[PDB]
């Protein structure tokens, strides 16, 4: 299986697997059952921004979701990523729909990773930023139903010509180049990622969510990881 760490923007509450009785954002450490959640006033049809940050000094992974002139949902969990992930991973976005649907459109996505080795200023870094997505976006790995070029956005899941979302759909996007997320002789390792999304639901019942994830280099969409599994895990364990 794949090692997965993710911050999920869960739009549908499945209490059968531990979901809070309402929209929430959470931190998953190898399990769809979040280790920490936080109510989230999901604003259907509006563009929102998501900020995820981490550093090895605090060893605390944090995230904030917000909409303009609206409030901010915050969640944080303490986790040493050196024990959970391999030093070489890949990053990306995942999202799904099941019985109910929603558009999981990504308007922009940027990321930045930094390594300060224990030899002073042995700083290595990686940075990418997407505000436009081309039809043929060669630096991205598209798995499942994810596509690009549409109005310059990334559609992680199925959406018809009429612009309405589809049910039972799974799609992800990963950056082409592997990322050195941590090293032993490292004094401070940190990364921060941002992305704007537009979750729209005509049927008024949104599902299932969008997620930012970190996995092993060769991570692929798991069987039946559609709907409530956010295309991240193979079972609700």
């Amino acid at each position: 299986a794949d090692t997965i760490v993710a911050v999920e923007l869960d739009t549908y509450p499945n209490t059968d697997i531990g979901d809070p009785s309402y929209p929430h954002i959470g931190i998953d450490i190898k399990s769809v059952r979040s280790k920490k959640t936080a109510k989230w006033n999901m604003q259907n049809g509006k563009v929102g921004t998501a900020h995820i940050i981490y550093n090895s000094v605090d060893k605390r992974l944090s995230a904030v979701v917000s909409y303009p002139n609206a409030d901010s949902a915050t969640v944080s969990y303490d986790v040493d990523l050196d024990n959970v992930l391999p030093e070489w991973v890949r990053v990306g976005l995942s999202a799904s729909t099941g019985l109910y649907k929603e558009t999981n459109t990504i308007l922009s996505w940027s990321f930045t990773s930094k390594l300060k080795s224990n030899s002073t200023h042995e700083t290595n870094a990686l940075h990418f930023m997407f505000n436009q997505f081309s039809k043929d976006q060669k630096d991205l790995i598209l798995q499942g139903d994810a596509t690009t070029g549409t109005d310059g956005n990334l559609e992680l899941t199925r959406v018809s010509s009429n612009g309405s979302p589809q049910g039972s759909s799974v799609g992800r996007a990963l950056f082409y180049a592997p990322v050195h997320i941590w090293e032993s002789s490292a004094v401070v390792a940190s990364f921060e990622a941002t992305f704007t999304f537009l979750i729209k639901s005509p049927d008024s019942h949104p599902a299932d969510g969008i997620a930012f994830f970190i996995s092993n280099i060769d991570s692929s969409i798991p069987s039946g990881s559609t709907g409530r599994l956010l295309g991240l895990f193979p079972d609700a364990n």
């Binding site: 739009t11 929209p23 006033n41 999901m42 604003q43 259907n44 049809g45 509006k46 909409y67 002139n69 609206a70 409030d71 729209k200 639901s201 005509p202 049927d203 008024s204 019942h205 949104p206």
Partner: peptide, 12 residues
């Protein structure tokens, strides 16, 4: 184009 389908939209 869409209005508070379900999730509580604070404001409009």
């Amino acid at each position: 184009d869409v209005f508070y389908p379900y999730p509580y939209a604070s404001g409009s």
